[PDB]
Coordinates of C-alpha atoms (C1' of nucleotides) and ligand atoms in Angstrom, one line a residue:
Chain A
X2 CA 213.4 77.1 -82.0
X3 CA 214.3 78.0 -78.4
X4 CA 217.7 77.6 -76.7
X5 CA 220.1 79.3 -74.3
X6 CA 222.9 76.9 -74.9
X7 CA 223.4 77.9 -78.6
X8 CA 224.2 81.5 -77.6
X9 CA 227.2 80.3 -75.6
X10 CA 228.2 77.6 -78.3
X11 CA 228.2 80.1 -81.1
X12 CA 231.0 82.2 -79.5
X13 CA 233.2 79.1 -79.3
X14 CA 232.4 78.0 -82.8
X15 CA 233.3 81.4 -84.2
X16 CA 236.6 81.4 -82.2
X17 CA 237.6 78.1 -83.7
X18 CA 236.5 79.2 -87.1
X19 CA 238.6 82.4 -87.2
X20 CA 241.7 80.5 -85.7
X21 CA 241.4 78.1 -88.7
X22 CA 240.2 75.0 -86.8
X23 CA 237.7 74.4 -89.5
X24 CA 236.7 70.9 -88.6
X25 CA 236.0 71.6 -85.0
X26 CA 234.0 74.7 -86.0
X27 CA 232.0 72.4 -88.3
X28 CA 231.1 70.0 -85.5
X29 CA 229.9 73.0 -83.5
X30 CA 227.8 74.5 -86.3
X31 CA 225.9 71.3 -86.7
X32 CA 225.4 70.9 -83.0
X33 CA 224.0 74.3 -82.9
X34 CA 221.6 73.4 -85.8
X35 CA 220.4 70.3 -84.0
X36 CA 219.9 72.4 -80.8
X37 CA 218.1 75.1 -82.8
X38 CA 215.4 72.8 -84.2
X39 CA 214.7 70.6 -81.1
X40 CA 211.1 71.1 -79.8
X41 CA 211.8 70.8 -76.1
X42 CA 214.4 72.6 -74.0
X43 CA 217.2 70.0 -73.6
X44 CA 217.2 68.8 -70.0
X45 CA 219.1 65.5 -69.5
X46 CA 222.7 64.7 -70.5
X47 CA 220.8 61.5 -71.6
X48 CA 218.6 63.7 -73.8
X49 CA 221.6 65.6 -75.3
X50 CA 223.5 62.4 -76.1
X51 CA 220.4 61.0 -77.8
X52 CA 220.5 63.7 -80.5
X53 CA 222.4 63.3 -83.8
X54 CA 225.1 66.0 -84.0
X55 CA 225.6 65.9 -80.2
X56 CA 228.3 63.6 -78.8
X57 CA 229.9 62.9 -75.4
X58 CA 231.8 66.2 -75.5
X59 CA 229.0 68.4 -76.7
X60 CA 226.6 66.8 -74.1
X61 CA 229.1 67.6 -71.2
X62 CA 229.2 71.3 -72.3
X63 CA 225.4 71.3 -72.4
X64 CA 225.2 69.7 -68.9
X65 CA 227.6 72.4 -67.6
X66 CA 225.5 75.3 -69.0
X67 CA 222.4 73.7 -67.3
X68 CA 224.0 72.7 -64.0
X69 CA 225.7 76.1 -63.6
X70 CA 224.8 79.1 -65.7
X71 CA 228.0 79.2 -67.7
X72 CA 230.6 77.5 -69.9
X73 CA 234.1 77.9 -68.4
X74 CA 235.8 77.5 -71.8
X75 CA 234.3 80.9 -72.7
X76 CA 236.6 82.6 -70.2
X77 CA 239.7 81.2 -72.0
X78 CA 239.2 82.3 -75.5
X79 CA 242.4 83.6 -77.1
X80 CA 242.8 87.3 -76.8
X81 CA 243.5 87.3 -80.6
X82 CA 240.1 86.2 -81.7
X83 CA 238.4 89.6 -81.9
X84 CA 241.2 90.9 -84.1
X85 CA 241.3 87.8 -86.2
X86 CA 237.6 88.2 -86.8
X87 CA 238.1 91.9 -87.7
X88 CA 240.7 91.0 -90.3
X89 CA 238.9 87.9 -91.8
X90 CA 235.9 90.1 -92.4
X91 CA 237.9 91.7 -95.1
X92 CA 236.7 90.1 -98.4
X93 CA 239.6 88.2 -99.8
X94 CA 241.4 87.7 -96.5
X95 CA 240.8 84.4 -94.6
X96 CA 242.3 82.8 -91.5
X97 CA 245.9 82.4 -92.9
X98 CA 246.2 86.0 -93.8
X99 CA 244.5 87.2 -90.6
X100 CA 247.0 85.1 -88.6
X101 CA 250.0 86.5 -90.5
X102 CA 248.8 90.1 -89.9
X103 CA 248.3 89.3 -86.3
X104 CA 251.9 87.8 -86.0
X105 CA 253.2 91.0 -87.6
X106 CA 251.8 93.2 -84.9
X107 CA 248.7 94.5 -86.6
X108 CA 245.6 95.0 -84.5
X109 CA 243.3 97.5 -86.3
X110 CA 242.1 98.2 -89.8
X111 CA 244.2 101.4 -89.6
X112 CA 247.3 99.2 -89.1
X113 CA 246.1 97.1 -92.2
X114 CA 245.5 100.2 -94.3
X115 CA 248.8 101.9 -93.4
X116 CA 251.2 99.0 -93.1
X117 CA 249.9 95.7 -94.5
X118 CA 250.5 94.3 -97.9
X119 CA 247.0 93.9 -99.5
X120 CA 246.0 92.0 -102.5
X121 CA 243.9 93.8 -105.1
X122 CA 240.8 91.9 -103.8
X123 CA 241.6 92.7 -100.2
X124 CA 242.1 96.5 -101.0
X125 CA 238.6 96.4 -102.4
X126 CA 237.2 94.5 -99.4
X127 CA 238.8 97.0 -97.1
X128 CA 237.5 100.0 -98.8
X129 CA 233.9 98.5 -98.7
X130 CA 234.4 97.1 -95.2
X131 CA 231.3 98.4 -93.5
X132 CA 229.1 98.0 -96.6
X133 CA 230.0 94.4 -97.1
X134 CA 229.0 93.5 -93.5
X135 CA 225.5 94.9 -94.0
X136 CA 222.6 92.9 -95.4
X137 CA 220.3 94.7 -97.8
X138 CA 216.5 94.7 -97.8
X139 CA 215.1 92.1 -100.1
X140 CA 213.5 94.9 -102.2
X141 CA 217.0 96.2 -103.1
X142 CA 218.1 92.7 -104.1
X143 CA 215.1 92.7 -106.4
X144 CA 216.2 96.0 -108.1
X145 CA 219.8 94.6 -108.5
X146 CA 218.4 91.3 -110.1
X147 CA 216.2 93.5 -112.5
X148 CA 219.2 95.7 -113.4
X149 CA 221.2 92.6 -114.4
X150 CA 218.2 91.0 -116.2
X151 CA 217.5 94.1 -118.2
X152 CA 221.1 94.3 -119.4
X153 CA 221.2 90.6 -120.3
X154 CA 217.8 90.6 -122.0
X155 CA 218.6 93.6 -124.1
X156 CA 221.3 91.4 -125.7
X157 CA 219.1 88.3 -125.9
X158 CA 215.4 88.2 -125.0
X159 CA 215.4 84.4 -124.4
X160 CA 218.0 84.7 -121.6
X161 CA 216.6 83.4 -118.2
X162 CA 217.8 85.3 -115.1
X163 CA 216.9 84.1 -111.5
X164 CA 218.1 85.5 -108.2
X165 CA 219.2 82.6 -106.0
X166 CA 220.9 82.4 -102.6
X167 CA 219.0 83.9 -99.6
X168 CA 216.7 85.8 -101.9
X169 CA 215.3 82.7 -103.4
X170 CA 215.1 81.1 -99.9
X171 CA 212.6 84.0 -99.1
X172 CA 214.8 85.8 -96.6
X173 CA 213.8 89.4 -95.7
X174 CA 217.4 90.6 -96.0
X175 CA 220.3 89.5 -98.2
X176 CA 224.1 89.5 -97.8
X177 CA 224.6 90.1 -101.5
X178 CA 222.8 89.2 -104.8
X179 CA 223.4 86.0 -106.7
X180 CA 222.1 85.9 -110.3
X181 CA 222.0 82.7 -112.4
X182 CA 221.7 83.1 -116.2
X183 CA 221.1 80.5 -118.7
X184 CA 219.4 80.0 -122.2
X185 CA 216.9 77.2 -122.9
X186 CA 218.4 77.2 -126.5
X187 CA 221.4 75.3 -125.1
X188 CA 223.9 77.5 -126.8
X189 CA 223.5 81.3 -126.6
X190 CA 224.7 81.6 -123.0
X191 CA 228.2 81.0 -124.4
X192 CA 230.6 83.9 -124.5
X193 CA 228.2 86.6 -123.0
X194 CA 230.2 87.6 -120.0
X195 CA 232.0 89.9 -122.4
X196 CA 228.8 91.6 -123.5
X197 CA 227.0 91.7 -120.1
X198 CA 229.8 93.0 -118.0
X199 CA 230.7 95.7 -120.7
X200 CA 227.0 96.8 -120.6
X201 CA 226.9 97.0 -116.8
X202 CA 230.1 99.0 -116.9
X203 CA 228.8 101.4 -119.5
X204 CA 225.9 102.3 -117.1
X205 CA 228.4 102.7 -114.2
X206 CA 226.5 100.0 -112.2
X207 CA 229.6 97.8 -111.6
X208 CA 232.2 99.6 -109.5
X209 CA 234.9 96.9 -109.0
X210 CA 235.7 93.3 -110.0
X211 CA 236.8 90.7 -107.5
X212 CA 236.9 87.6 -109.6
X213 CA 236.5 87.8 -113.3
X214 CA 238.6 85.8 -115.7
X215 CA 237.6 87.7 -118.8
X216 CA 240.6 86.4 -120.8
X217 CA 238.9 82.9 -120.7
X218 CA 236.0 82.3 -123.1
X219 CA 234.8 79.7 -120.6
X220 CA 234.7 82.1 -117.6
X221 CA 232.0 80.7 -115.2
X222 CA 231.4 83.4 -112.6
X223 CA 231.7 87.1 -112.0
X224 CA 232.1 88.2 -108.4
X225 CA 232.1 91.9 -108.0
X226 CA 230.7 95.1 -106.6
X227 CA 227.8 97.2 -107.7
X228 CA 225.8 100.3 -106.6
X229 CA 222.4 101.4 -107.7
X230 CA 222.0 104.9 -108.9
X231 CA 220.8 108.0 -106.8
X232 CA 221.3 109.0 -103.2
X233 CA 221.4 106.8 -100.2
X234 CA 222.8 103.8 -101.9
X235 CA 225.6 101.6 -100.6
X236 CA 228.0 99.3 -102.5
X237 CA 226.7 95.7 -102.7
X238 CA 228.3 92.4 -103.6
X239 CA 227.0 90.9 -106.8
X240 CA 227.7 87.4 -108.0
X241 CA 226.7 86.3 -111.5
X242 CA 227.0 82.8 -113.0
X243 CA 226.3 81.8 -116.6
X244 CA 225.5 78.1 -117.2
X245 CA 224.4 75.9 -120.0
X246 CA 220.8 74.9 -119.9
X247 CA 221.4 71.1 -119.3
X248 CA 223.0 72.2 -115.9
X249 CA 220.2 74.6 -114.9
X250 CA 218.6 72.5 -112.3
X251 CA 221.9 71.6 -110.6
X252 CA 223.1 75.2 -110.9
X253 CA 219.9 76.5 -109.3
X254 CA 220.1 74.0 -106.5
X255 CA 223.7 74.9 -105.8
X256 CA 223.3 78.6 -106.0
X257 CA 220.2 78.6 -103.9
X258 CA 221.8 76.8 -101.0
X259 CA 222.1 77.2 -98.1
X260 CA 225.8 76.1 -98.0
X261 CA 224.9 73.6 -95.2
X262 CA 222.0 72.3 -97.1
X263 CA 224.2 71.7 -100.2
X264 CA 227.0 70.1 -98.1
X265 CA 224.4 67.8 -96.6
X266 CA 222.8 66.9 -99.9
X267 CA 226.2 66.2 -101.5
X268 CA 227.3 64.0 -98.4
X269 CA 224.2 62.1 -98.9
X270 CA 224.5 61.6 -102.7
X271 CA 227.8 60.2 -101.9
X272 CA 226.4 57.6 -99.6
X273 CA 224.3 56.4 -102.5
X274 CA 227.0 55.9 -105.0
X275 CA 226.3 59.3 -106.6
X276 CA 228.1 62.7 -106.8
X277 CA 226.3 66.1 -106.8
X278 CA 227.9 69.3 -108.0
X279 CA 226.7 72.7 -109.5
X280 CA 227.2 71.0 -112.9
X281 CA 225.4 67.6 -112.4
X282 CA 224.2 64.7 -110.4
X283 CA 226.2 61.6 -111.5
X284 CA 226.9 58.0 -110.7
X285 CA 230.2 57.7 -108.8
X286 CA 233.4 56.8 -110.6
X297 CA 234.1 57.3 -114.7
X298 CA 230.5 58.0 -113.4
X299 CA 227.5 58.8 -115.7
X300 CA 225.6 62.1 -115.6
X301 CA 221.9 61.5 -114.8
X302 CA 219.2 63.7 -116.4
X303 CA 218.0 66.4 -114.2
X304 CA 215.6 68.8 -116.0
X305 CA 214.2 70.3 -112.7
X306 CA 215.3 70.5 -109.0
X307 CA 212.6 67.9 -108.3
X308 CA 214.5 65.4 -110.4
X309 CA 217.6 65.8 -108.2
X310 CA 215.4 65.2 -105.1
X311 CA 213.7 62.2 -106.7
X312 CA 216.9 60.6 -107.9
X313 CA 218.4 60.9 -104.4
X314 CA 215.2 59.2 -102.9
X315 CA 214.3 62.5 -101.1
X316 CA 211.0 64.4 -101.1
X317 CA 211.2 67.8 -102.6
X318 CA 211.9 70.8 -100.3
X319 CA 210.8 74.4 -101.3
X320 CA 213.8 76.8 -101.2
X321 CA 212.4 78.4 -98.1
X322 CA 212.9 75.0 -96.3
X323 CA 216.6 74.8 -97.3
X324 CA 217.6 77.5 -95.1
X325 CA 220.0 75.8 -92.9
Chain B
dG1 C1' 233.7 69.1 -82.9
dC2 C1' 230.6 65.0 -85.3
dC3 C1' 230.2 60.6 -87.4
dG4 C1' 230.8 55.7 -89.5
Chain C
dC1 C1' 250.5 75.1 -105.6
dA2 C1' 248.0 77.6 -101.1
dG3 C1' 244.6 80.6 -100.0
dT4 C1' 240.0 82.2 -100.6
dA5 C1' 235.8 82.1 -102.3
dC6 C1' 230.9 80.4 -104.1
Chain D
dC1 C1' 241.2 55.7 -87.9
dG2 C1' 239.9 59.5 -90.8
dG3 C1' 236.3 62.2 -93.6
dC4 C1' 233.9 66.2 -93.1
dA5 C1' 231.3 68.8 -100.6
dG6 C1' 232.6 69.9 -104.8
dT7 C1' 234.3 73.3 -107.5
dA8 C1' 236.2 78.2 -109.6
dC9 C1' 239.9 82.3 -109.7
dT10 C1' 244.3 84.5 -108.1
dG11 C1' 249.3 85.2 -108.1
Ligands
LIG401 N1 228.9 81.4 -98.9 C1 229.1 80.2 -99.3 N2 228.2 79.8 -100.2 C2 228.3 78.5 -100.7 C3 229.3 77.6 -100.2 N3 229.2 76.4 -100.8 C4 228.2 76.6 -101.6 O1 227.8 75.6 -102.4 N4 227.6 77.8 -101.6 C5 226.5 78.3 -102.5 C6 225.3 78.2 -101.5 C7 225.0 79.7 -101.2 O2 223.6 79.9 -100.9 C8 225.4 80.3 -102.6 C9 225.6 81.8 -102.6 O3 226.6 82.1 -101.5 P1 226.3 83.4 -100.7 O4 227.5 83.6 -99.7 O5 225.9 84.6 -101.5 O6 225.0 82.8 -99.8 P2 223.5 83.3 -99.5 O7 223.0 84.2 -100.5 O8 222.8 81.9 -99.1 O9 223.6 84.1 -98.0 P3 223.9 85.7 -98.0 O10 224.6 86.1 -99.3 O11 222.5 86.3 -97.8 O12 224.7 85.8 -96.8 O13 226.6 79.6 -103.0 C10 230.2 78.1 -99.1 O14 230.9 77.3 -98.5 N5 230.0 79.3 -98.7
LIG402 MG1 237.4 87.4 -95.6
LIG403 MG1 224.1 85.7 -101.4

DNA sequence: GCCG
DNA sequence: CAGTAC
DNA sequence: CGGCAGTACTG
């Protein structure tokens, strides 16, 4: 858990990421993970090369940081990167939009606010800019889960509500709250976004909607914004997903993450003639859905030993 | 960027 | 669809 | 050479 190479490599990874070089940024992210969980400090080029996730090129960069104290490429990062990061930290704006605003001459959030064309989602990101960069204490994520759960349960007592994401992975702070709802009755989950969201609105808890297709009877997710009542409260991102019970174990696995963990698990299923999504684990193609009543069944069918959510925190 |  | 998001 | 996870809204 100790390295001084990763500090330098993260700056590069983030730069490629905000410039839209998503594959290169992915190679970096994994290299960093490998470096992060190596016992020893890495000392030989030979030793770097030996690691999975670390190729010829990553090894040369490591040998440079060791040999000298620096990575020369860090001196040549595009001058646009800090601005592109500023702009892609607006919820609903990504690298393409950031790059366009840059090309148009914008350089600050004041330029965005006064001159840029914003989508509805972006106007909401912008207005909650600081809040959405903050992580909340896990105790607050608890209160948010409980607000959602009380609202759901009032409608139907048998509804099951579990906070997922970082919260379920045991983290002390959380970027937002992700709540998964199902019903062991196989049926009653259907159509409730109507009732649940209307309830949470009546209380004034939800302050804005980001993604909510409420014209569709088969809406899967709500992504939006909430604020607990009373003084000293900030706006928080809230994600709610409602899933049939047969999909509960796959939904829980998915929504718990981490994102890297899921990508890795899916890559791996794929090497075994299988396919893993938030809905199911299947044979590959028309494939067959396999029965997965618990997360442990997903692990077992992939030939892997179970991992507690706290150990998925890649 | 990494890997098969 | 492209972009963005989980 | 070429995948790199698989899927859900928006406009
Ligand atoms: N953010 C993100 N989440 C993903 C992706 N793919 C994916 O399956 N997920 C799942 C795994 C995440 O743990 C889950 C919830 O997303 P999230 O952004 O709220 O993630 P989180 O709770 O783990 O982290 P955080 O909010 O505390 O920052 O959605 C992805 O590419 N990005
Ligand atoms: Mg953004
Ligand atoms: Mg989260």
